[PDB]
Amino acid sequence: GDRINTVRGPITISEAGFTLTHEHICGSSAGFLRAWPEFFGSRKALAEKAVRGLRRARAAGVRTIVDVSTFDGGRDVSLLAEVSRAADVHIVAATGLWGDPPLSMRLRSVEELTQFFLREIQYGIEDTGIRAGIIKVATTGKATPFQELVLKAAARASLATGVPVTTHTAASQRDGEQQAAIFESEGLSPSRVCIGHSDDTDDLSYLTALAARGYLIGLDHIPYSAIGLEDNASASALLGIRSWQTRALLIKALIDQGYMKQILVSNDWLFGFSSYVTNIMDVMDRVNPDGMAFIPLRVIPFLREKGVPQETLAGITVTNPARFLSPTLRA
Amino acid sequence: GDRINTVRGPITISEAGFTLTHEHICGSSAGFLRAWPEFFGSRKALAEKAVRGLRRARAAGVRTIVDVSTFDGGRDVSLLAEVSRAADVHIVAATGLWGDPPLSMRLRSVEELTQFFLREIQYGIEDTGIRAGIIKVATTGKATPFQELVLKAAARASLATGVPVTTHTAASQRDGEQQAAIFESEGLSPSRVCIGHSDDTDDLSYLTALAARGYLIGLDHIPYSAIGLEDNASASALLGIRSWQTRALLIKALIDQGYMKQILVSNDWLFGFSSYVTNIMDVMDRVNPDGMAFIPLRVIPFLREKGVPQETLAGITVTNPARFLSPTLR
Ligand SMILES: C[As](C)(=O)[O-]
Ligand SMILES: C[As](C)(=O)[O-]
Ligand SMILES: [Zn+2]
Numbered sequence: 301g302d303r304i305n306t307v308r309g310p311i312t313i314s315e316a317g318f319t320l321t322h323e324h325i326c327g328s329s330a331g332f333l334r335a336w337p338e339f340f341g342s343r344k345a346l347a348e349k350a351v352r353g354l355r356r357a358r359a360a361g362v363r364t365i366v367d368v369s370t371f372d373g374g375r376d377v378s379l380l381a382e383v384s385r386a387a388d389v390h391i392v393a394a395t396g397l398w399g400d401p402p403l404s405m406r407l408r409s410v411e412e413l414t415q416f417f418l419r420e421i422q423y424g425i426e427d428t429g430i431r432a433g434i435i436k437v438a439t440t441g442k443a444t445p446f447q448e449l450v451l452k453a454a455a456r457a458s459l460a461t462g463v464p465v466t467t468h469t470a471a472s473q474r475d476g477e478q479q480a481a482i483f484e485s486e487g488l489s490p491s492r493v494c495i496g497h498s499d500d501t502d503d504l505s506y507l508t509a510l511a512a513r514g515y516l517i518g519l520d521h522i523p524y525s526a527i528g529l530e531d532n533a534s535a536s537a538l539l540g541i542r543s544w545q546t547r548a549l550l551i552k553a554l555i556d557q558g559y560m561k562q563i564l565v566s567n568d569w570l571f572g573f574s575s576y577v578t579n580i581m582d583v584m585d586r587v588n589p590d591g592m593a594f595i596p597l598r599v600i601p602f603l604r605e606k607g608v609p610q611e612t613l614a615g616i617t618v619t620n621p622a623r624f625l626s627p628t629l630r631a
Numbered sequence: 632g633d634r635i636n637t638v639r640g641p642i643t644i645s646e647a648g649f650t651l652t653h654e655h656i657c658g659s660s661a662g663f664l665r666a667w668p669e670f671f672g673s674r675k676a677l678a679e680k681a682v683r684g685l686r687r688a689r690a691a692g693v694r695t696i697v698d699v700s701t702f703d704g705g706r707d708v709s710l711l712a713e714v715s716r717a718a719d720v721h722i723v724a725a726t727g728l729w730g731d732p733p734l735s736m737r738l739r740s741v742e743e744l745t746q747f748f749l750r751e752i753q754y755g756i757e758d759t760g761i762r763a764g765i766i767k768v769a770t771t772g773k774a775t776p777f778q779e780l781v782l783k784a785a786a787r788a789s790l791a792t793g794v795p796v797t798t799h800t801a802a803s804q805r806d807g808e809q810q811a812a813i814f815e816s817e818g819l820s821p822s823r824v825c826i827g828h829s830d831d832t833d834d835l836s837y838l839t840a841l842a843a844r845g846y847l848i849g850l851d852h853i854p855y856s857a858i859g860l861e862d863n864a865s866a867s868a869l870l871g872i873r874s875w876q877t878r879a880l881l882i883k884a885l886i887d888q889g890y891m892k893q894i895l896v897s898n899d900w901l902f903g904f905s906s907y908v909t910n911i912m913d914v915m916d917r918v919n920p921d922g923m924a925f926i927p928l929r930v931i932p933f934l935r936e937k938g939v940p941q942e943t944l945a946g947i948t949v950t951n952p953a954r955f956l957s958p959t960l961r
């Protein structure tokens with residue numbers, strides 16, 4: 301662990317700089333962007349949109365994003381490579397499986413899924429030689445028998461390579477506790493694991509208990525809010541009705557409890573989003589015109605106004621991501 | 632119609648010759664061959680295996696196969712074009728959706744799905760310019776709401792372009808009756824539609840009722856049998872416990888009832904199969920070493936011996952597929 305894999309190759313830990321640890325270029329399904337690009341206008345329109353976004357996030361000080369799109373969330377690593385190069389923003393690619401595995405994945409054993417995740421980390425994604433730098437996994441409430449396999453394989457791959465694991469939860473159902481249990485059953489260090497979408501709970505003790513055990517806490521979808529458009533059931537279900545300030549104040553909460561070193565922050569933004577209702581992207585872009593810049597432009601200043609030391613903010617946005625992304629084998 | 636689109640471009644209707652109407656190069660999931668080729672040993676190994684198979688089918692008289700792998704069933708049209716060229720066998724590619732749509736498909740409207748099926752027929756698949764020549768759709772028992780949409784969009788695409796529709800059914804549940812109802816509600820001619828996997832029933836009345844209405848009946852997985860592998864639960868679920876001769880006798884039954892013109896026959900073979908249990912391809916290749924050559928090598932002489940005139944067998948394996956695949960507007 302002296303280098304972090306990106307879609308442009310390895311970078312040093314110090315090169316990562318300000319890092320958004322949970323983002324997407326395009327939330328889709330495997331093959332979908334290749335087969336139906338006109339769903340996004342065109343592939344070129346999507347790329348141009350991504351580059352404009354990335355460039356504006358760069359302007360606000362973002363140096364690196366971690367794209368946590370998996371194979372079943374439509375990751376297209378050649379698009380990532382293209383936009384990373386055009387925008388001059390580092391991108392870290394993911395392996396793992398998210399909430400929508402097709403049959404060829406759902407039927408696999410824990411050993412098979414381990415070999416798959418290892419392939420994407422060690423050999424590269426598809427025929428690109430681009431090596432994943434993180435492993436994304438998911439539950440939404442109690443794990444399905446298959447999701448149990450996925451978590452165990454992610455733990456096995458992370459123990460082998462040192463690359464971290466980062467998760468989708470339903471935070472209101474306290475999924476992080478079962479995920480931690482399964483990870484620890486495989487002997488994974490909690491410091492290898494980010495329990496994501498954790499900004500969906502106001503249950504502060506659920507977060508503090510996990511932080512105290514060494515887990516990273518992903519407060520990773522701060523701009524998500526349907527305040528102002530709650531008639532729209534599909535957007536409400538996705539964005540929630542808690543304000544961005546509510547989400548952002550959990551960062552301050554965990555800091556105030558002594559866990560500044562356990563916090564990772566992100567927007568969870570995307571430039572295309574086919575795996576939900578049509579035009580959800582337009583709805584989201586009107587909610588948060590800053591897009592991926594929302595963290596530096598809105599959240600960091602808000603927290604400083606609320607008294608959080610800038611140096612603590614820097615620890616959260618630079619140190620924590622570098623420590624987490626640094627591949628780290630156990631002793 | 633006057634041309635059938637293949638992965639190598641348009642062929643004339645006479646050029647199709649002996650045609651297997653329900654096959655696969657690789658039964659997989661979208662993206663899966665590109666992301667994890669080592670599941671199949673390697674892409675190279677899978678291709679070499681397909682080329683061997685296709686060349687042996689060609690030796691047995693197969694000129695054309697229809698690969699009914701959709702987007703969600705792992706179709707990789709570049710693979711198809713590669714092996715079609717190497718083996719010198721015409722391959723017709725499909726659009727549609729089979730039984731494993733991802734979210735980005737499952738969440739779509741009938742109008743959106745229609746546009747996607749049209750793109751693959753009219754434009755091309757992915758960035759390849761390879762145009763589909765058939766639309767595959769699926770139910771397994773009563774149609775879900777999304778499946779209604781898929782069938783309606785298939786019907787609308789077939790009415791627009793004239794390319795046929797072919798189906799997966801659970802024949803035990805008489806899915807062809809609902810499929811037909813849907814297709815007819817959209818105004819699609821039955822002669823544009825093959826009701827597939829129909830060799831899984833023994834209810835000849837179900838089949839004749841469809842054949843009478845002008846549907847094509849796809850007796851399409853003749854070599855599928857788990858007789859002798861009763862201990863293998865997953866193989867038995869897939870293959871069934873009826874023999875190949877029992878499946879093949881349905882062809883003669885339909886001929887005898889007067890419906891030779893409604894019958895399409897195939898193996899439903901594959902060279903890779905990731906969308907099922909591990910090693911299912913090894914189990915199936917043991918059951919049926921002939922692979923896609925099974926129809927010409929075993930089935931056609933079996934029927935000949937039972938009394939079926941060779942002219943009849945030729946009408947089934949050449950004339951019917953030509954009439955089906957010929958794009959035909961209302
Ligand atoms: C692709 As998501 C809304 O689970 O971060
Ligand atoms: C890929 As199949 C077994 O539905 O023909
Ligand atoms: Zn750099």
Ligand SMILES: [Zn+2]
Pocket residue numbers: 468469497
């Ligand atoms: Zn998520």
Ligand SMILES: [Zn+2]
Pocket residue numbers: 497500521524538539540
């Ligand atoms: Zn949420």
Ligand SMILES: [Zn+2]
Pocket residue numbers: 322323324368568
């Ligand atoms: Zn996400």
Ligand SMILES: [Zn+2]
Pocket residue numbers: 609610611
């Ligand atoms: Zn300070």
Ligand SMILES: [Zn+2]
Pocket residue numbers: 642646721
């Ligand atoms: Zn030819």
Ligand SMILES: [Zn+2]
Pocket residue numbers: 798799800828
């Ligand atoms: Zn089928």
Ligand SMILES: [Zn+2]
Pocket residue numbers: 828831852855869870871
């Ligand atoms: Zn069957």
Ligand SMILES: [Zn+2]
Pocket residue numbers: 834836837
């Ligand atoms: Zn009956």
Ligand SMILES: [Zn+2]
Pocket residue numbers: 653654655699899
């Ligand atoms: Zn099939």
Ligand SMILES: [Zn+2]
Pocket residue numbers: 940941942
């Ligand atoms: Zn004769």
